[PDB]
């Protein structure tokens, strides 16, 4: 449905509403909660990313010292960008109920690229674990400052699913 | 393959069941208030946020 | 930058280099002033959301039926106005004067809000919190984020921007 | 007069003294890294943020 968007030369937007969206919500499990879950990620993308990268640094502040992985704002900004890219591919995996595109368009070759550039794998592992923790926290009403504007209920199955997409990233970059 | 072009799926979810419609925004067929949008965009660098994290990483926010 | 504003043209103006070096001679404390404007605009979203939130939390009737910001549109319009006001204040601080803030934001605004039922007490709380937040950043009293500036005293610019917020408060009281 | 068109001066301040340049962003004359941009823009509604305030207004944030 949105697969055309992934492959189009310029990625112009596709939209799904009305009866086509009714159908879409039937082909993925827990369609309504799933949409709230995707919304939680993308609506909070900035804070998810900045909190996770900040925590990788506060646990290992040599990362912002000379020779460190996010020394200088150019590298810091590139790291924040990558964390958003990864988060966004995870958001799309949760929308679609599978990880084919995350695996193909995000993870395939990424370790090799980080190894060539010297991006520290231990830092990457911590950034991912925090993004995972933050997203699951939102979805399970364990976020402390901001709660989601949803009907109250249990989203544990979607939390486990999105956790598995983050684990695909962590495993690929280990 | 990861293309190295910084492009990622940008998903947007809409719930407009209050009926508040902004001009120019009807992009698919429907009258129930729901829509999902996906585009492929290059994710940009944010110098302001990089500056902030470089300064403020050691502050615990949001009761984390 | 008056051309940008005088006309509805909608086009951006840019100034850099020796041009900006000169412009900074026409306002006091040019460099700290640019840091101060940057702090306002870089944090605009959180300044606005914290101030409108503080509004509601002291008077939660405002989001009950018949309240000033009940429904998403009314809340969104309020957040929008709070950002409009903050941005006119940011422009006053960039330029060192309040002429545009008065002519293009305040002139006629009390009367519009009277017609539409935008309550003055709620506006007063939102402005006071935006003022406190902005001064907090400029004076190193923000607790979750600090500015990336040399350490120094910015009390004079804090008092100047406080005066701009006070022009808004006085207009809308 | 307030034009009731939601338009406000949108100021952007750039400090690019670290030498990091983005393609297509040089809009003024200068090599010292500094630039100020001003444009008049209609300030838009953010329904997601309105929803968030409606849910979350009573939580104190930022050591406020
Ligand atoms: C998106 C911002 C946000 C809102 C809003 C909210 O309500 N919660 C939010 C973020 C959030 N963060 C976490 C978990 C962690 N965040 C960090 C980094 C910070 N801890 C530090 O020590 C540090 C430097 C001083 C930080 C900056 C860490 C380490 C975690 C824990 C990661 C883990 O492996 O568990 C969450 C999850 C819920 C929680 O409160 O812990 C959320 C929602
Ligand atoms: C932009 C967000 C932010 C960051 C980041 C940061 O470091 N400080 C930030 C905001 C900020 N807020 C204030 C002051 C106030 N904020 C509120 C609203 C909240 N108080 C509530 O009771 C409430 C509902 C539960 C809120 C939401 C208020 C009332 C104030 C005080 C205003 C006053 O008259 O003093 C500041 C100023 C410094 C501080 O920590 O108080 C800042 C920087
Ligand atoms: C974990 C994700 C959350 C949690 C989420 C829940 N959402 C529930 C019902 C629900 N959500 C929507 C909006 C959603 N559907 C769409 O099509 C789109 C946009 C395209 C959106 C944003 C709807 C329509 C519904 C049905 C109920 C209603 O409208 O009131 C829900 C109830 C269970 C269920 O219906 O499966 C839950 C639990 N709730 C939580 O507390 C955590 C934080
Ligand atoms: C390198 C990757 C940096 C980074 C640089 C970026 N700057 C972006 C927008 C931008 N920067 C300026 C200032 C520059 N232009 C000039 O004319 C002068 C002085 C004469 C300077 C110092 C301007 C005016 C602009 C906006 C252009 C406009 O409004 O028309 C930018 C954005 C590109 C995008 O959003 O896709 C970038 C990436 N950003 C980083 O994180 C690192 C540290
Ligand atoms: C309250 C405002 C702050 C405080 C700010 C200070 N800034 C100081 C010097 C300074 N800042 C800049 C960047 C600024 N000038 C520009 O043209 C632009 C972009 C267009 C910006 C963002 C510069 C270039 C300078 C001078 C070179 C340098 O000092 O690095 C400063 C020192 C005093 C002075 O120069 O007047 C201060 C105190 N510091 C604080 O602790 C509060 C939070
Ligand atoms: C009324 C003033 C509301 C308000 C509504 C806004 N929606 C905006 C963007 C938007 N909304 C949709 C969903 C809508 N279009 C459809 O085709 C369908 C169903 C088939 C629906 C339910 C879409 C697709 C879009 C994006 C339009 C595009 O991608 O071309 C919007 C603009 C946001 C902005 O300018 O930043 C507004 C203002 N927003 C509010 O706060 C009140 C509550
Ligand atoms: C953040 C948690 C990391 C960190 C990240 C860095 N990545 C750097 C350059 C870079 N990253 C990619 C992968 C990115 N591009 C894509 O197209 C996609 C998926 C579609 C992804 C996820 C590429 C291709 C590149 C280089 C080419 C480019 O940037 O356009 C980077 C700069 C490193 C350097 O120049 O030395 C950083 C800092 N670095 C860290 O320490 C933490 C752990
Ligand atoms: C927020 C702290 C308030 C709150 C504010 C509301 N304002 C509403 C509508 C509105 N606001 C203006 C003034 C605004 N437009 C401009 O062009 C400029 C400056 C250039 C300003 C500051 C106008 C003209 C209007 C009506 C037209 C429109 O919405 O575009 C509003 C909705 C009222 C309505 O729908 O009639 C609200 C809720 N309300 C509160 O309770 C707190 C105190």
Author numbering:
A (entry chain D): 4 to 177
B (entry chain J), D (entry chain A): 1 to 64
C (entry chain B): 5 to 177
Q: What's the paper's own text on this?
A:
We show that the cryptophyte Hemiselmis andersenii expresses an energetically complex antenna comprising three distinct spectrotypes of phycobiliprotein, each composed of two αβ protomers but with different quaternary structures arising from a diverse α subunit family. We report crystal structures of the major phycobiliprotein from each spectrotype. We propose that the macromolecular organization of the cryptophyte antenna consists of bulk open and open-braced forms that transfer excitations to photosystems via this bridging closed form phycobiliprotein.
The largest peak of HaPE555 (555 A) is by far the most abundant PBP constituting approximately 63% of the overall protein complement (with other HaPE555 spectrotype peaks contributing 8%). All five crystal forms of protein HaPE555 are constructed from continuous filaments of PBPs, which are organized into two-dimensional rafts. The filaments are generated via knobs-into-holes packing but differ in the distances between adjacent molecules along the filament (having either tight or loose interfaces). This packing brings the chromophores of neighboring PBPs closer together increasing the possibility of energy transfer. The bulk antenna proteins, HaPE555 and HaPE560, are densely packed to form a concentrated glass of proteins as evidenced by electron micrographs and FRAP experiments. We have shown that HaPE555 and HaPE560 form the bulk of the light harvesting antenna (roughly 6/7 of the PBPs) and capture the highest energy photons. Thus, HaPE555 and HaPE560 have evolved to capture photons that would be otherwise lost by the integral membrane photosystems: they plug a spectral hole.
